[PDB]
Amino acid sequence: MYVRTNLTILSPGWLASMTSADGTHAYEMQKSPVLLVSWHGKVMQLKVEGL
Amino acid sequence: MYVRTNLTILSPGWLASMTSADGTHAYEMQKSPVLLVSWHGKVMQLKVEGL
Amino acid sequence: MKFKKPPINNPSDDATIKLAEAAVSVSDSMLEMAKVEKVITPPSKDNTLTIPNAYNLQARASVDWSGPIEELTARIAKAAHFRFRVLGKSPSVPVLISISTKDESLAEILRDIDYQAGKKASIHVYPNSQVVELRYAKIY
Amino acid sequence: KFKKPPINNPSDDATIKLAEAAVSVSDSMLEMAKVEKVITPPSKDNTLTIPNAYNLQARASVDWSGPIEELTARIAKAAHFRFRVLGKSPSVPVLISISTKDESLAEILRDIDYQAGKKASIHVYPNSQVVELRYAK
Amino acid sequence: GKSPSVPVLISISTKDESLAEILRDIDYQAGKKASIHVYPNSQVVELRYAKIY
Amino acid sequence: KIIDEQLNKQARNLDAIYDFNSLVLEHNILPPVLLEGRNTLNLADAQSIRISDRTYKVAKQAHFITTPPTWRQYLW
Amino acid sequence: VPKLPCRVDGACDATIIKMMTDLNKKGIKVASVGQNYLISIPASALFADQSPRLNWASYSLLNEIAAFLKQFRKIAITVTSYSSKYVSVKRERALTLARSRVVSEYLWSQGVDSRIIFTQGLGSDKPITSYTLGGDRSPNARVEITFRRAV
Amino acid sequence: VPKLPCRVDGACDATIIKMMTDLNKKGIKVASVGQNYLISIPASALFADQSPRLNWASYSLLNEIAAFLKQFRKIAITVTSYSSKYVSVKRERALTLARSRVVSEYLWSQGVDSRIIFTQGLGSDKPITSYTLGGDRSPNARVEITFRRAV
Amino acid sequence: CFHPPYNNFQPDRRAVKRVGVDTGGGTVGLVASIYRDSKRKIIRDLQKQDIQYVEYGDTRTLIIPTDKYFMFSSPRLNEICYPGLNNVIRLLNFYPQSTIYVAGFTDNVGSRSHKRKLSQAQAETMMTFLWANGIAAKRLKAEGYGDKNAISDNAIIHGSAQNRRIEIQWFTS
Amino acid sequence: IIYYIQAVIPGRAWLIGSNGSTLTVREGSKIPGYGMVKLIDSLQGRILTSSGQVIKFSQ
Amino acid sequence: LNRFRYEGAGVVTGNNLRTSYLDLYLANEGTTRLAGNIGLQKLEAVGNGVTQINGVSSRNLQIVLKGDPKVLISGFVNLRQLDMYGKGTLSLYWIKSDTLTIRAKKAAKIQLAGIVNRLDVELWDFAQFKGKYLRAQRSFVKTHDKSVAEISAVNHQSSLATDASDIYYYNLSKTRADFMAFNGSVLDMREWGQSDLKDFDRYNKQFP
């Protein structure tokens, strides 16, 4: 799974990580039906579908 | 059989004994349907289910 | 003559009980580890030398944050009316900070942040020019 | 006439014991960090201070990632100061990467020397408007 | 001493005798594995395992 | 479902007590895991017993990681 | 549809605007400019004469304010306390700061889903009106809360 | 589940409460704190005037209190005696010790499942009240039992 | 009438209010007042609340739950249960010469020094509260122990919950 | 040997020694191990020493 | 010489006097200067006059004023109890005592400094007590209407105010208890300027 966002992924780890000059974060990692991030000091969960 | 407890085992003996620093005992022993233990100077029988 | 005992509360939960049973042992182990570490290594000084409190640092705060650092300290500086500077560079691995308290002032809050950062980063203050300087750990 | 109790309060024995354990472990971790963390003396920190010169108070934006020699030469030219270096140029030159929008060349040079650290440092003379880049050995 | 992996077991069934006699009986039944000592002026009761093997 | 929602309700203290990043080594490497036992005795057969005071074992060798784990991959 | 909620939980804009109207009717100052909301409360209706204490009935107003703040989604809250000039500057600043601490503590005890709360007291270091005949009765002495509605 | 008894046999909380209430109605002091339980009886229902002998009629109350005691589960039970100041220290100590010894022996003979029974008598060394007008009628003289509930 | 914040630390004019609302008869008002202010009625009210009272000879004790009457991990005191404290003051009005001891007990988990500090804080808060309630300081002394003389097991959750406690002892002469 | 301040007044201070030595110290006075007294503060329990160290309240 | 009672409205001045104990009864605004080393356990003055005494060292002393004198005393005193009913002003230098009980009725301006192991203060009205620089391990304060108390508690502080009673504490005690009935007030009123100030901890966050 390849994911592009501007959040900060915490839960599942990853292998490939890169960031643009504008803080956009791109990751490549193993498939997982979920993610967990922190927004502004609040932990939130993201549901991944389509698997 | 492997048993994890904190009491003292009497009847069928055992082959491997171990104790944690906390005060928890673990035993590897032969199979049995019953066990005899000492609780506070009082005898006690324990029935084994699902052999 | 009705007979009872003082503590009567709402019913508990068995899973919570088991969680507490684990947690008490974990906490005791951590306490013993901290004690032995303090014994073996004697501390020398304190960060308050490099982070001395001053006026207008007594405006009080209460936070609950368990995320990154940069925006948190930037908001703190903006509230304090202090010029923010960053030295070093943010590494690829993010530096995460978990903080939860109530009614702690700026000086001790910043000291706690610095201690929790530990080896990854450091904080310094300059009341002469109202400067908050955050320095990363440049190694390798 | 109505002071409601706190909504998220540990109104159970298990909850209150858990919260007490959390306080204890937080305190223990704080002690651990306190003893283990090393500090540095502000009387001995090796960070070049602000040259406090008027021409060093300008504002600019700069993005760079590469060798420092030409960068500091350009900065000195912008500040209208003579610039020179001493030492032997390392085979693999020192590299930095600064991206910034609105601050002053004083802080720029400060961070430059900080990132340089052991390999090289910089010195500023405002009496004779010069900047020196000193290498290591 | 150190508690041996094999525990020390006893069987006590008596009636209305002194603490000193109880302790002496305990020491007798323990025998070679452990011993009991008393320091009255310090009000101390001590047991010692047997250093053996 | 009941236990999961109860755990979710009682959230903050769980991470507060089970954080790992405070224990993670400087080099972004998870330190290994050790197992300790004391007062071990075994018998193989007649005329064959072995006694040891303490034993220490290494479960998982240390390795790098990008993010500290959490209670997520252990409780829910 | 039932799986993913249509709105943030506990959202009723009709109730929100109705309660804002009720507060302004009762005289609590409510104002919105852009994504930033501000609410001012005269100190006379809450505290006694130059006192760090509250009457019992003030808890009703406190509960109303907490219920309002529950609805919105925010990160940072700033509370400040202004007062008149009585004896000195330090005493007034201390009184304002203590009052701010008390109100902030009760708010945090209540279910305000915030991230950061700042408390400041300024005493009479910046007046709001040229009329200063009254003491604590004067409208200048008050408390103020500011925040930004973030997304 | 059917093999496992639903409860420890011969146990009924209602019966426990009823008998404890009846005992305190009779006038024997009963106190409960946590798992620690204490009971106290004046010597007027057990012995003659400073006598190490047991009145025959007292056996009914002895049986009742033993029946109540056996209901719970224990490890060790302590019985202590307190007396007035009559002749010396030695005489009082010996009398208290004899009383405690006899009552402990009878209790142990009765069907009580206590692993350990401790007995002692301090005579007139730790008075419970300053009112010492009466002799054996004084509430200060007494025999008491204490125990810790076993889970 | 009355004020929830302990009526601003003044004696209550309660019997006059009761007889007035009764007349709104004298005899029934008086019997209502005696029924209300009867010492045994007060003790029954304390039993109705989560407070225990123990009498034995001439020394008497009172048992208070730390969690129910305190903010968690806070030397502050919850104001919700103020009727219990009012009853405490009214009852202690009946012993105007007894000396006072107050002590606190906590659980078995955490830093022992921290436990001692918390117990001291709770005990001092209670003693100062009574001092404000109007008894001269020379008659009182506070003490917060650690976890020495437990009344229940600490390895059991409910046992520890019962264990954490506040005790008040007073003699007669 | 270490000294401490106990009672502080404008102009006059009360000094205790590690051995229990008492002292009623004015601004002009030589104090052993610390040299000469110059200035005292009522607001802050800090007294500068001619030798160059600072003496505060005990803990 | 053990006793001196002065009536006659005169001027008295003396220095370099030595004694064990003496008792003084001053009257009629006798302007009195004393510059000797004197111990004493009793002292009384009518009022409306000034009095200076340099050097006092006694094991005990008890004083209760009646009029409105202007007294200043230097030395070391172990005091027990003080009462005030007029418009008095008093000041000391050092006190090595453990138990003090102070009652104030009408007006007293008291400047005290020293060591106290236990202090009780009662203020009725128009009593301004500046016990700054007077460190006390145990402090109890009771203030009625129109009272001002500057306190220097150390470890354990108890304070109750009825209404319009101000109590400012210039030190953070390890245990604080403050209560206001109608319009009481208790404030830290500290400097905020020192570089080594300490903030609240678990055993301090008591809120007014």
Automatic annotation (TrEMBL), chain C:
<protein>
    <submittedName>
        <fullName>DotD</fullName>
    </submittedName>
</protein>
<dbReference type="InterPro" id="IPR031817">
    <property type="entry name" value="DotD"/>
</dbReference>
<keyword id="KW-0732">Signal</keyword>
<dbReference type="Pfam" id="PF16816">
    <property type="entry name" value="DotD"/>
</dbReference>
<keyword id="KW-0449">Lipoprotein</keyword>
<dbReference type="InterPro" id="IPR038140">
    <property type="entry name" value="DotD_sf"/>
</dbReference>
Automatic annotation (TrEMBL), chains G, H:
<dbReference type="GO" id="GO:0016020">
    <property type="term" value="C:membrane"/>
</dbReference>
<keyword id="KW-0472">Membrane</keyword>
<feature type="domain" description="OmpA-like">
    <location>
        <begin position="34"/>
        <end position="151"/>
    </location>
</feature>
<protein>
    <submittedName>
        <fullName>LphA (DotK)</fullName>
    </submittedName>
</protein>
UniProtKB/TrEMBL annotation, chain I:
<keyword id="KW-0472">Membrane</keyword>
<protein>
    <submittedName>
        <fullName>Outer membrane protein, OmpA family protein</fullName>
    </submittedName>
</protein>
<keyword id="KW-1133">Transmembrane helix</keyword>
<dbReference type="GO" id="GO:0016020">
    <property type="term" value="C:membrane"/>
</dbReference>
<feature type="domain" description="OmpA-like">
    <location>
        <begin position="57"/>
        <end position="173"/>
    </location>
</feature>
<keyword id="KW-0812">Transmembrane</keyword>
UniProtKB/TrEMBL annotation, chain J:
<protein>
    <submittedName>
        <fullName>DotF</fullName>
    </submittedName>
</protein>
